[PDB]
Amino acid sequence: GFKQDIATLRGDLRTYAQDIFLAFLNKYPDEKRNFKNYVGKSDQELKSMAKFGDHTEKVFNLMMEVADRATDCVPLASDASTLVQMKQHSGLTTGNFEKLFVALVEYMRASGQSFDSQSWDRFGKNLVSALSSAGMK
Ligand code: HEM
């Protein structure tokens, strides 16, 4: 289920983080507009770029923590407040996070593996709701 999925993802976090974040950027190419540097780069090149490797790992490191602290796929309000109040996320709306999670769920559906994709779908909507409540536009 959801908790085992966090363990599966953490077991190979660099590869899963890169694969899911590339799935997000390829599904929603307009999202690169938050990432000027990423324009005109294939996947294997993005994987070569420091701000990409670095961002992508910190994203999934912190998302796995938020997932781990959740009860029944409902994140802590504190984890939502902390994401909203990150200076780097100033330009972001809940729409950015929704799309990440849509891409994550699609990725899990398409994998060979017994991910609990419905739990991730709920986790994504519950995180979007929490972010709104904590003040994200
Ligand atoms: C659960 C989802 C996410 C988490 C946990 C997260 C976490 C973080 C963290 C920890 C940083 C700072 C990392 C560092 O300084 O090394 C950061 C920066 C940033 N995040 Fe996010 N992020 C998330 C989703 C997003 C999304 C969906 C976008 C855009 C669609 C985004 C755009 C950025 C940008 C532009 C920066 C700073 C510049 C850069 O990416 O290099 N983040 N994020």
In the chain, helix, strand, coil percent, each to 5? 75, 0, 25
Atom of ligand 1 nearest to the CA of 31: 30
Q: Is 33 in the pocket of ligand 1 (CB under 6 A)?
A: no
Contact 55, 61 (CB under 8 A): no
**Half-sphere exposure of residue 125, counting CA atoms within 13 Å on the CB side?**
7
Partners of 28 in beta bridges:
none
- Please tell me the distance between residue 52's alpha carbon and the centre of ligand 1 in angstroms: 10
Q: Is 17 in the pocket of ligand 1 (CB under 6 A)?
A: no
Q: Is 102 in the pocket of ligand 1 (CB under 6 A)?
A: no
Q: Is 118 in the pocket of ligand 1 (CB under 6 A)?
A: no
User: Domain of 79?
Assistant: 1-137
Q: CA–CA distance from 52 to each of 26, 30, 76, 77, 105 (Å)?
A: 14, 17, 27, 28, 21
Separation of alpha carbons 134 and 79, rounded Å: 9
Q: How many domains does the chain have?
A: 1
Contact 134, 80 (CB under 8 A): yes
